[PDB]
């Protein structure tokens, strides 16, 4: 009578071939080329009856080495020993109790947060996870309030957890990551304004402002979004004084399966974008291999999408984008330039025994006069088994 009625168990399967090719010689390491199979166990109970409902969730991970050689092993699909050898496997299991009162919900334990201020990475074999507690509340129509504290994370290619730190810096760690968020949706569900504040204890404080609108016009579906991060050092300020403002925004137009979109992004201040180690960001140029977040980096993006439904081939989609950056500072030089060209093709079998089986290919070129030039390919096989 509930609890057992809204319960679900799924087994996510991801077969991944990853090949990042470094073009410049001597690159010391010529290549990251690995192949792995991941398993993602997610089991949720429903909630016990009563005004205060209890429930529990479980996240299980298993990554298996299918092919690797130490000369080419840092791909991020697998943990990597000091000898340079990939692990043959790694696993992880976290439980997550949950309470629900009215329209307010609390989860503690192993978490998969997808927050503008803390976006869990899923760019390899197995998801990044966090450890702590999340509150989510929507007692008011249109409004969603967020609060929580994280204490540790587990990176995508690790069984283990570790204290939090900031991407690209390390050295300074924290026990305590506290946030608060508010999100108001209006104009017949079209417009939305967001407000966020996060505090990585004794390292940084980060504000985030968000503005977005989405509206259909006959056959056109236009979308506009703009966000702003403002990050300063905080407390004892272990990384020292920090100073980044980071702007992002795009506009998107879609009609008859075709999508075109332009994006802009700019890093202001002595520091580039500051975020939690290994985490993703909602910045528009956070793309396949690079995210264009170096100090002072100004960048834009043009993106094209097509949904092959219209041709009579549903499940087939294609995407291409070009990202260009300038004025990046890298001790060696200011006016650092880079450009990345991504190509995404995906197919999902829509009928038959193999319904929902998915194959996706991601290809990227990156060239720069500061970053390492790369060519990257990933083959991704996907399927989700309900239990």
Ligand X SMILES: CCCCCCCCCCO[C@@H]1O[C@H](CO)[C@@H](O[C@H]2O[C@@H](CO)[C@@H](O)[C@H](O)[C@@H]2O)[C@H](O)[C@H]1O
Ligand Y SMILES: CCCCCCCCOCCOCCOCCOCCO
For the CA atoms of 273, 179, 120, 158, what is the dihedral angle to 10 degrees? 100
Radius of gyration of the chain (CA): 22
DSSP 223-280: EEEEEEEEEEE-TT-TT-S-EEEEEEEEEEEEETTEEEEEEEEEEESSS----BTT-B
Which residue, 154 or 301, has its beta carbon nearer to ligand X? 154
Residues forming a β-bridge with 368: 338
Please report whether residue 151 would count as binding ligand X according to CB under 6 A.
no
Burial of 71: CB neighbours in 10 Å, binned 0-12, 13-18, 19+: exposed
Q: How far is the CB of 202 from ligand X (least distance, A)?
A: 22
Between vectors from CA 245 to CA 243 and to CA 247, what angle results, nearest 5°?
A: 160
Stretch that binds ligand Y, among 89-97, 189-197, 207-215, 293-301 (CB under 6 A): 89-97
Interacting stretch for ligand Y, rule CB under 6 A, among 87-95, 117-125, 321-329, 346-354? 87-95
310 forms part of the interface with ligand Y (CB under 6 A): no
* Residues between 329 and 358 with contacts to ligand Y, criterion CB under 6 A: 343, 345
Other beta carbons within 10 Å of 189: 10
Question: How far apart, in whole angstroms, are the C-alpha atoms of residue 104 and residue 141?
Answer: 13
Q: Looking at beta carbons, which pairs linking 298-301 to residues 24 or more positions away fall under 8 Å?
A: 298/265, 298/266, 298/267, 298/325, 298/326, 298/327, 299/264, 299/265, 299/266, 299/323, 299/324, 299/325, 299/326, 300/262, 300/263, 300/264, 300/265, 300/324, 301/250, 301/261, 301/262, 301/263, 301/264, 301/265
Q: Between 80 and 303, whose beta carbon lies closer to ligand X? A: 80
| By CB under 6 A, residue 41 contacts ligand X | yes
Is 131 a binder of ligand Y (CB under 6 A)?
yes
* Interaction between residue 109 and ligand Y (CB under 6 A): yes
Quick one: which of 9, 27, 52, 93 contacts ligand Y (CB under 6 A)? 93
Rounded distance between C-alpha atoms, residue 128 and residue 104, angstroms:
25
Nearer to ligand X, 41 or 54 (CB): 41
The site partner of 62 among ligand X, ligand Y, none (C-beta below 5 to 8 Å per kind) is ligand X
* Rounded Cα–Cα distance for residues 344 and 317 (Å): 8
* 58 interacts with ligand X by CB under 6 A: no
Q: Backbone breaks in the chain (C–N > 2.5 Å) follow which residues?
A: none
Q: How far is the CB of 357 from ligand X (least distance, A)?
A: 19
Instruction: Quote the tokens at residue 53.
Output: 């409902």
| Distance in Å, CB of 158 to ligand X, minimum | 8
SS3 198: strand
Of 211 and 343, nearer to ligand Y (C-beta) is: 343
Distance CA 17, CA 66 (A): 9
- The yes or no reply on residue 160 touching ligand X (CB under 6 A) is yes
173 versus 304: smaller Cβ distance to ligand Y: 304
Interface mask toward ligand X for 82-121; x: CB under 6 A: ---------xxx----------------------------
Which string of x and - marks every residue 33-72 that binds ligand Y (by CB under 6 A)?
Answer: --x-------------------------------x-----
The residue from 2, 60, 282, 315 that contacts ligand X (CB under 6 A) is: 60
Kindly state the number of chain residues that form the binding site for ligand X, as judged by CB under 6 A: 11
Complex with ligand Y: residue 35 or 229, whichever CB lies closer: 35
Identify the bridge partners of residue 44 per DSSP, sorted by sequence position.
Answer: 8, 57
Closer residue to ligand Y (CB): 97 or 282: 97
Residues of this chain that bind ligand Y (CB under 6 A) = 15, 17, 35, 67, 93-95, 109-110, 131, 318, 320, 343, 345, 359, 363, 379, 381
Residues of this chain that bind ligand X (CB under 6 A) = 39, 41, 60-62, 91-93, 159-161
């Amino acid at each position: 009578e509930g609890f057992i009625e809204d319960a679900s168990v799924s087994l996510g399967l991801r077969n991944l071939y990853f090949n990042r090719d470094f073009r410049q010689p001597g690159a010391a390491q010529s290549k990251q080329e690995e192949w792995a199979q991941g398993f993602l166990l997610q089991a949720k109970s429903g909630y016990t009856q009563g005004t205060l409902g209890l429930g529990v969730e479980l996240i299980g991970q298993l990554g298996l080495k299918l092919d690797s050689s130490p000369d080419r092993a840092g791909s991020g699909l697998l943990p990597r020993h000091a000898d340079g050898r990939a692990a043959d496997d790694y696993a992880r299991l976290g439980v997550a109790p949950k309470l629900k009162l009215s329209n307010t919900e609390l989860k503690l334990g192993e978490l998969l947060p997808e927050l503008p201020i803390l976006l869990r990475n899923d760019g390899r074999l197995l998801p990044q996870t966090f450890q702590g507690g999340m509150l989510t509340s929507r007692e008011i129509a249109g409004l969603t309030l967020h609060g929580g504290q994280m204490r540790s994370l587990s990176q995508r290619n690790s069984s283990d957890h570790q204290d939090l730190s900031v991407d690209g810096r390390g050295g300074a760690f924290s026990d305590r990551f506290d946030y608060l968020g508010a999100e108001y949706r209006f104009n017949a569900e079209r417009s939305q304004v967001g407000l966020w504040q996060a505090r990585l204890q004794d390292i940084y404080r980060q504000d985030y402002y968000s503005l977005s609108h989405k509206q259909s016009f006959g056959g056109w579906r236009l979308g506009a979004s703009v966000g702003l991060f403002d990050t300063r050092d905080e407390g004892a300020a272990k990384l020292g004084e920090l100073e980044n403002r980071a702007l992002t925004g795009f506009f998107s137009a879609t009609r008859g399966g075709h999508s075109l979109g332009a994006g802009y992004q700019r890093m202001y201040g002595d520091d580039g974008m500051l975020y939690i180690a290994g985490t993703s960001t909602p910045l528009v140029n956070d793309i396949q291999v690079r995210n264009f977040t170096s100090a002072g980096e100004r960048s834009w993006q043009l993106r094209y999408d097509y949904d092959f439904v219209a041709l009579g081939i549903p499940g087939l989609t294609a995407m291409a984008r070009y990202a260009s950056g300038a004025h990046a500072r890298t001790k060696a030089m200011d006016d650092g330039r880079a450009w990345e060209r991504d190509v995404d093709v995906a197919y999902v079998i829509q009928s038959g025994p193999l319904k929902n089986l998915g194959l996706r290919w991601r290809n990227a070129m990156l060239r720069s006069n500061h970053a390492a030039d790369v060519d990257e390919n990933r083959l991704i096989l996907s399927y989700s088994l309900p239990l």
